[PDB]
Fold Protein S100-A1.
Amino acid sequence: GSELETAMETLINVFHAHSGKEGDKYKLSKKQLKELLQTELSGFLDAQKDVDAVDKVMKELDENGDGEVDFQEYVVLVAALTVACNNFFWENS
Amino acid sequence: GSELETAMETLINVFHAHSGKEGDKYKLSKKQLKELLQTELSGFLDAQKDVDAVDKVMKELDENGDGEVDFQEYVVLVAALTVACNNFFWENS
């Protein structure tokens, strides 16, 4: 349909990727969320210019890293650390 | 970097699209969230097989549609109505 519609289709593509092999199928554990982030990313964490935003995403694990995600919680987090590093308005070129 | 990394780069592409012209620049109003959804989508709402999930996303507007989003709240919602219609495990072909 559009670049936006397929945008979400790309997120689930990686989700069901591991959830299919080993996981809760319908959902995924938070333990993997750690590696799953870097394992797939491994670029946004190579900066982390900010700290307040980086603390929030990290604070989540500090609170309770025992549970399971539900896509919505996995897609939202992916955007969390994104802004923490990503420099759009902060810097142009 | 990867299909996942660019995945988020596609979401912001549409965000700054309107926010740039008319909006809060740093953020966007919720009033547009309505049309912004269909205007861009116009496919997931052509089904809405579920109701409980469709009620949540809609309930948000029922509560208070007066405010501004912050990407994280715009990307998470985009995935909300997605699962409401999207039929992955529910149906294969």
